[PDB]
Amino acid sequence: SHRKYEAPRHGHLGFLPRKRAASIRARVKAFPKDDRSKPVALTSFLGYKAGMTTIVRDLDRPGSKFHKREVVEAVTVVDTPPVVVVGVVGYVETPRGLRSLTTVWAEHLSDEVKRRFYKNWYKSKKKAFTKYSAKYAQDGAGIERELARIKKYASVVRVLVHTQIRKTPLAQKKAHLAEIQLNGGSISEKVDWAREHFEKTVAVDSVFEQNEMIDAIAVTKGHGFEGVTHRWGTKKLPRKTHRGLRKVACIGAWHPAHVMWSVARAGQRGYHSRTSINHKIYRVGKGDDEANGATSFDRTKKTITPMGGFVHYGEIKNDFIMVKGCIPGNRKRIVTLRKSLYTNTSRKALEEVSLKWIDTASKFGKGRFQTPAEKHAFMGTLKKDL
Amino acid sequence: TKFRISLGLPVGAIMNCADNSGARNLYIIAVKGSGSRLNRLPAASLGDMVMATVKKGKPELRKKVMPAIVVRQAKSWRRRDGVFLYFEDNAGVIANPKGEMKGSAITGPVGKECADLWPRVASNSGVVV
Amino acid sequence: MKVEIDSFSGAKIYPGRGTLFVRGDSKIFRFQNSKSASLFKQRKNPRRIAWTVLFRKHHKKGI
Amino acid sequence: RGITIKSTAISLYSEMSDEDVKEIKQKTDGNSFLINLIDSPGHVDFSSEVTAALRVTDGALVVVDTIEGVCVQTETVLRQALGERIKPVVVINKVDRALLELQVSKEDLYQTFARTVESVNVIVSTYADE
RNA sequence: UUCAUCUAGACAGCCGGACGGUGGCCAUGGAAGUCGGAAUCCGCUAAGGAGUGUGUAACAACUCACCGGCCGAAUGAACUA
RNA sequence: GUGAACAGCCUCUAGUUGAUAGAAUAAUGUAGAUAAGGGAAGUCGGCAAAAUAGAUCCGUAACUUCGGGAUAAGGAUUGGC
RNA sequence: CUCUUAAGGUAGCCAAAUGCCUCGUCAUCUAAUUAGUGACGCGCAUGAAUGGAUUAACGAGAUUCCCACUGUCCCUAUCUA
RNA sequence: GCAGUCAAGCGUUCAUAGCGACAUUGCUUUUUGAUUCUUCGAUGUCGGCUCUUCCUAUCAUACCGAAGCAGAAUUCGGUAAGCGUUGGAUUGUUCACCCACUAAUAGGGAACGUGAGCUGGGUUUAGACCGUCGUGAGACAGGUUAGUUUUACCCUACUGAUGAAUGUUACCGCAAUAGUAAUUGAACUUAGUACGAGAGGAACAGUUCAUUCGGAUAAUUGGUUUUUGCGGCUGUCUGAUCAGGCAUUGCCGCGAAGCUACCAUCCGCUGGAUUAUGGCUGAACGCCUCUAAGUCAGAAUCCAUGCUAGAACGCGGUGAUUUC
Numbered sequence A: 001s002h003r004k005y006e007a008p009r010h011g012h013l014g015f016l017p018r019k020r021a022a023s024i025r026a027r028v029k030a031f032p033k034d035d036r037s038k039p040v041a042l043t044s045f046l047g048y049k050a051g052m053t054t055i056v057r058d059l060d061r062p063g064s065k066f067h068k069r070e071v072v073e074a075v076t077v078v079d080t081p082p083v084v085v086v087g088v089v090g091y092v093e094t095p096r097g098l099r100s101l102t103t104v105w106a107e108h109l110s111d112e113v114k115r116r117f118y119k120n121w122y123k124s125k126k127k128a129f130t131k132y133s134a135k136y137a138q139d140g141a142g143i144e145r146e147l148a149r150i151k152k153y154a155s156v157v158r159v160l161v162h163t164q165i166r167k168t169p170l171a172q173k174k175a176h177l178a179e180i181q182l183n184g185g186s187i188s189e190k191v192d193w194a195r196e197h198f199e200k201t202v203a204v205d206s207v208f209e210q211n212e213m214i215d216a217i218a219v220t221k222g223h224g225f226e227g228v229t230h231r232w233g234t235k236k237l238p239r240k241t242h243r244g245l246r247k248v249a250c251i252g253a254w255h256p257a258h259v260m261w262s263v264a265r266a267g268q269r270g271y272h273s274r275t276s277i278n279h280k281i282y283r284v285g286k287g288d289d290e291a292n293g294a295t296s297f298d299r300t301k302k303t304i305t306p307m308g309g310f311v312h313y314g315e316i317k318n319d320f321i322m323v324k325g326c327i328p329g330n331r332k333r334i335v336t337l338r339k340s341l342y343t344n345t346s347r348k349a350l351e352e353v354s355l356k357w358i359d360t361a362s363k364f365g366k367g368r369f370q371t372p373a374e375k376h377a378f379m380g381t382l383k384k385d386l
Numbered sequence B: 001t002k003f004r005i006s007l008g009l010p011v012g013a014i015m016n017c018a019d020n021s022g023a024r025n026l027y028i029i030a031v032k033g034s035g036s037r038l039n040r041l042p043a044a045s046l047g048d049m050v051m052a053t054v055k056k057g058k059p060e061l062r063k064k065v066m067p068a069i070v071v072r073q074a075k076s077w078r079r080r081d082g083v084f085l086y087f088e089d090n091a092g093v094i095a096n097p098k099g100e101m102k103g104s105a106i107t108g109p110v111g112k113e114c115a116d117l118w119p120r121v122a123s124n125s126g127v128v129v
Numbered sequence C: 001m002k003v004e005i006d007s008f009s010g011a012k013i014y015p016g017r018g019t020l021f022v023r024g025d026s027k028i029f030r031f032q033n034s035k036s037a038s039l040f041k042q043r044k045n046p047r048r049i050a051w052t053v054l055f056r057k058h059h060k061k062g063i
Numbered sequence D: 001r002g003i004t005i006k007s008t009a010i011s012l013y014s015e016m017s018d019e020d021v022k023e024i025k026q027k028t029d030g031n032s033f034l035i036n037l038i039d040s041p042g043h044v045d046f047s048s049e050v051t052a053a054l055r056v057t058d059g060a061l062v063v064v065d066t067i068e069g070v071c072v073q074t075e076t077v078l079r080q081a082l083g084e085r086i087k088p089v090v091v092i093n094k095v096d097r098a099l100l101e102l103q104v105s106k107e108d109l110y111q112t113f114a115r116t117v118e119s120v121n122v123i124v125s126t127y128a129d130e
Numbered sequence E: 001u002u003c004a005u006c007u008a009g010a011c012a013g014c015c016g017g018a019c020g021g022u023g024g025c026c027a028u029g030g031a032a033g034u035c036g037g038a039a040u041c042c043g044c045u046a047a048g049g050a051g052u053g054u055g056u057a058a059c060a061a062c063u064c065a066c067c068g069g070c071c072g073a074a075u076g077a078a079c080u081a
Numbered sequence F: 001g002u003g004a005a006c007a008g009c010c011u012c013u014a015g016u017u018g019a020u021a022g023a024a025u026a027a028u029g030u031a032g033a034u035a036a037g038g039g040a041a042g043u044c045g046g047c048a049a050a051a052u053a054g055a056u057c058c059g060u061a062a063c064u065u066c067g068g069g070a071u072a073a074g075g076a077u078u079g080g081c
Numbered sequence G: 001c002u003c004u005u006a007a008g009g010u011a012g013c014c015a016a017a018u019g020c021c022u023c024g025u026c027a028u029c030u031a032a033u034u035a036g037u038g039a040c041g042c043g044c045a046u047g048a049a050u051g052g053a054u055u056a057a058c059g060a061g062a063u064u065c066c067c068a069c070u071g072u073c074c075c076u077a078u079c080u081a
Numbered sequence H: 001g002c003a004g005u006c007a008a009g010c011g012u013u014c015a016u017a018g019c020g021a022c023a024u025u026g027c028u029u030u031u032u033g034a035u036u037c038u039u040c041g042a043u044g045u046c047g048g049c050u051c052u053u054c055c056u057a058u059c060a061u062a063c064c065g066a067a068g069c070a071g072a073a074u075u076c077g078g079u080a081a082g083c084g085u086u087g088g089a090u091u092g093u094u095c096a097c098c099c100a101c102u103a104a105u106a107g108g109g110a111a112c113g114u115g116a117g118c119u120g121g122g123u124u125u126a127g128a129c130c131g132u133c134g135u136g137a138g139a140c141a142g143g144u145u146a147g148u149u150u151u152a153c154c155c156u157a158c159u160g161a162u163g164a165a166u167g168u169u170a171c172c173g174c175a176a177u178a179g180u181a182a183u184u185g186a187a188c189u190u191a192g193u194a195c196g197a198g199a200g201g202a203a204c205a206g207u208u209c210a211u212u213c214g215g216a217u218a219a220u221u222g223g224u225u226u227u228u229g230c231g232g233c234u235g236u237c238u239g240a241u242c243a244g245g246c247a248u249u250g251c252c253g254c255g256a257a258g259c260u261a262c263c264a265u266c267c268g269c270u271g272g273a274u275u276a277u278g279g280c281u282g283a284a285c286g287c288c289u290c291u292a293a294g295u296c297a298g299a300a301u302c303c304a305u306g307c308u309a310g311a312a313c314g315c316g317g318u319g320a321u322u323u324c
């Protein structure tokens, strides 16, 4: 017989399987469509989620009941140190998909990126790329021919870049290596861009701008084995239920005489690769620029780092991208931010935010003070110091 | 017309009658503009128009359904400006389907969004928030 | 925007922080945290709770 | 509602110049006039108060829309004025409407006025006694 | 398969006429071909129904049967499986 | 000892330290709890849970077999020195 | 006025744990009630120690409503063993 | 139960806008019958809750054709199952009825889906009362009350999780295949405009929100307390103090972290081909004709862009590859 009461399905079948991602770094499965008139530029960047805070900004939304007055908005801050270009990968179009023709790496690789190629760095002999570095003996004749093949072929060109993770407070110490597609015309210039940029750093200012809508690709926070009630949002069974109530009552009809893929069942929740789109950047702040967390209306000399440091992450000392709302992944986790795959014109994009105030109070509690100066000015003299 | 306000008055809630129409409380039975979902109770927020009955009040106001407008919520809700606020009690005013109040005066404050949504409630209100 | 003042303890309230309570007499009470909110609902005296700025002023602390 | 349901009297004071008082084919004296103005209702459902208004007055301000032209009620309300021997003066209204909506370029506006007056004058011609 | 039109000009196509007795009789508040019952006539006729429809309160005004003008060779209808 | 008390809790004499253990703390369970706003809208059904609770003082209805109902209901107080 | 019995259900009571029709009719209770209560009674098939009716008090008896109360639920979440 | 053919008539005229008699042709197996083929060394028998999928005989939403379509509203129909289809009073109930919101509260199957998923209100053991029937034991699709819902650790299915082998190991990639997602409403403006005598009353474009769903996330707010973190309190014990033990976490207030809440916040993409349909040229059939050749636009459709997984016997590139 019929369900007797219609209700929307619990969970989304397009996010299957709900398994652990194969890597702690989420894969960028699509890059922006290449427009061969624009200059050569990175279409993505590599950063690490530091934490969240709040801001105040005037809402610029004509037609809204609440236009031109102040809104408090949550923002996620991602530490984004400049990425070092260490390679170049070419992809030629084949009737079976894209295929990597060849990859040309930089002459000298830092131990940070070399650590990625070892599971046991402490006892290794660090022989990686030592014969490859000999390819640059006198003129790099093999290298220039290898790049020439990329120009003659390889309709898609990607640079191999790695995070400068020793600049982050993370104890990881091992960089994350990823391929970023080079958009912009004249593929030959793409290889010229990559070859010129070997061993060179690329800053987040050259990828992202204020007010830009970007895509967050990250592996969500893992939660281990989870019951159906929280994994899918299924209704809790009554208290009277025997053998437990945090279950799905009917997992299938008699026929088909099988459990169907569409039935919510217990398993791993989280640690999934997600690509969340249309998150607006509110800040592209600079690590060397003291008073990061200040705005044109505050001017107070305070960095973006909250009082006592970002909880579970540490202090931010590099370039950071502040996005509106939240992004997949937890603190300290590698995240990749890419360009929007389309041109969004809906007055939520193209809306030019100007921050009025940034919350720098401690996230380690019910923070009362933005800066240590304010704490002294409020409480006055203490017995320990001050 | 209104941003989403944390619902704190599901169907069956009894709130204080805030006008001078002679009723002492309103018993919510439905919410205008409420959605549909299996097992989900329709719930009212600040400024919402509901259908209500008079449980205590003047005898001719009782035993019949009438529109009401919620003027105080008492359930913490979040404005866009970050302020989580709530009143001391739940309170609404009897009104016609067109939003015009049956009574002539307000006892207690009135929510900002309720005053914005209903000019008659705003006009009969004193201090707001 | 403009920083408000906790009605119970006198602590500065920054945008988005704490809670707001409108009494039946329409009086506004802004609380910087659940501790101050709970103490106010418990009806403790700010003059008597030893860490509030009003207590410190009444006892000539800090000045 | 947006409609007129009654006929309310209002009194108006009007000063003018000497040069147009000379342009009057009526025995007059002075330079000031007093107007007793009635706002009749347009609906046929309230077409009795306009009869009361017409009896208590002597002139009729026949307002005509240039968009809709001569309507059924303009037919009716002017007929009763002519039955009471009321002299009508016609004003063509909503010319702004025709100039933003109909986009009449140079001659269509003149022709609408021409057709309007002809249709109005037909009404007074056949319902006027000698 | 059967029956019809057809170089003395078939079908289709486009164009012209579609009258007079006469607003036929009776009814109808009005009924003039065209709300109705009945009468389904005559004359001029290449031809026109006491009308094929639209339409008017009723007239009117178009339209169609009907006959012609242009082209010149096939065409139409009803059935069978 | 607290306490009206052989109630519950702690201690003195006496007795025992006997139940296979070690490591983590997934789901679902068993047992114990808490939860903003609403307050039975859940459900066959207030099932389960919560709420009340001791003592002192005030006050206590309908009905009644006059004996009760009755701790009716409804209230106020309680520490230390 | 009849047919008819041993006598033809009296006092009482009822859609009652007894009424099919039936979710009976009216009133009240609710926003809405096959529930509850108060009435009516040609009552399939109520009824007088096969005891009728009414009863204070009592009941881990069945049912209805109200206040309070609360995760029963909106809508789930967290913690401990 | 649903759908057709003919058209005497209804529909002011007018068989076919919408209907449609007398007849007649069918379809379906959510009705109930008919039968007794399977099951009596036993397929757990109603209803509700939960959850998934499927059908379309489509209530709403998308695009349209027709009207006895002026507007609005409404009615008939087409492509269409993509996406929704509720909260409650009574009753075990399915069903029914009413209140109310809603865009709508469409109909159904999946062993009349679903009891080693629950519950047990009903039916349907044994106890008990009443009415009727019976001399009686007892009977009642008559009413009422109480009445044990057992087992998974096996295989498969599903959800997750490892894993030998391809020289080894490590990194960066491709995407065959499989899945897929967004839904709907309100307000302002157009505009009191089109239309209409009037009453009334749109629609395209644009803007701000909201509903349902989905995926994340904890800046703030709320919850959570074994942080047994601080403080307070009771009883007892350590001679008193200080400091503490016990009261199965002794209780109370606050409480950071983590987890978590439409109880909190953010986000949820755009190109083509098509269906119905409306058309272009143009015969068949000197005319006509959206159709026959050909062709334009066009739906919540389909396929793609995008998102998820990465074939563990699909593949590529790249680094190092055991002086002993």
Ligand SMILES: Nc1nc2c(ncn2[C@@H]2O[C@H](COP(=O)(O)OP(=O)(O)OP(=O)(O)O)[C@@H](O)[C@H]2O)c(=O)[nH]1
Residues within 6 Å of the ligand: D002, D003, D004, D005, D040, D041, D042, D043, D093, D094, D095, D096, D097
């Ligand atoms: N655009 C435009 N609108 C006009 C003009 N004149 C009148 N109107 C519209 O016509 C409507 C009716 O006019 P009003 O004067 O307000 O009232 P009224 O004409 O008396 O109508 P009733 O009271 O019902 O008889 C108004 O609401 C105007 O919007 C005009 O000149 N231009």
Ligand SMILES: [K+]
Residues within 6 Å of the ligand: H039, H040, H042
């Ligand atoms: K059997």
Ligand SMILES: [K+]
Residues within 6 Å of the ligand: none
């Ligand atoms: K917390």
Ligand SMILES: [K+]
Residues within 6 Å of the ligand: none
């Ligand atoms: K102690």
Ligand SMILES: [Mg+2]
Residues within 6 Å of the ligand: A002, A003, A005, A006
């Ligand atoms: Mg359904």
Ligand SMILES: [Mg+2]
Residues within 6 Å of the ligand: A240, A241, A242
């Ligand atoms: Mg049980």
Ligand SMILES: [Mg+2]
Residues within 6 Å of the ligand: A311, A362, A363, A364, A365, A366
């Ligand atoms: Mg914190």
Ligand SMILES: [Mg+2]
Residues within 6 Å of the ligand: B038, B039
């Ligand atoms: Mg339900």
Ligand SMILES: [Mg+2]
Residues within 6 Å of the ligand: C034
């Ligand atoms: Mg907290």
Ligand SMILES: [Mg+2]
Residues within 6 Å of the ligand: D003, D004, D039, D040, D041, D042
């Ligand atoms: Mg007027």
Ligand SMILES: [Mg+2]
Residues within 6 Å of the ligand: none
């Ligand atoms: Mg006629």
Ligand SMILES: [Mg+2]
Residues within 6 Å of the ligand: none
């Ligand atoms: Mg004692």
Ligand SMILES: [Mg+2]
Residues within 6 Å of the ligand: F035
């Ligand atoms: Mg609660």
Ligand SMILES: [Mg+2]
Residues within 6 Å of the ligand: none
């Ligand atoms: Mg509460």
Ligand SMILES: [Mg+2]
Residues within 6 Å of the ligand: F039
């Ligand atoms: Mg209450």
Ligand SMILES: [Mg+2]
Residues within 6 Å of the ligand: none
């Ligand atoms: Mg209920």
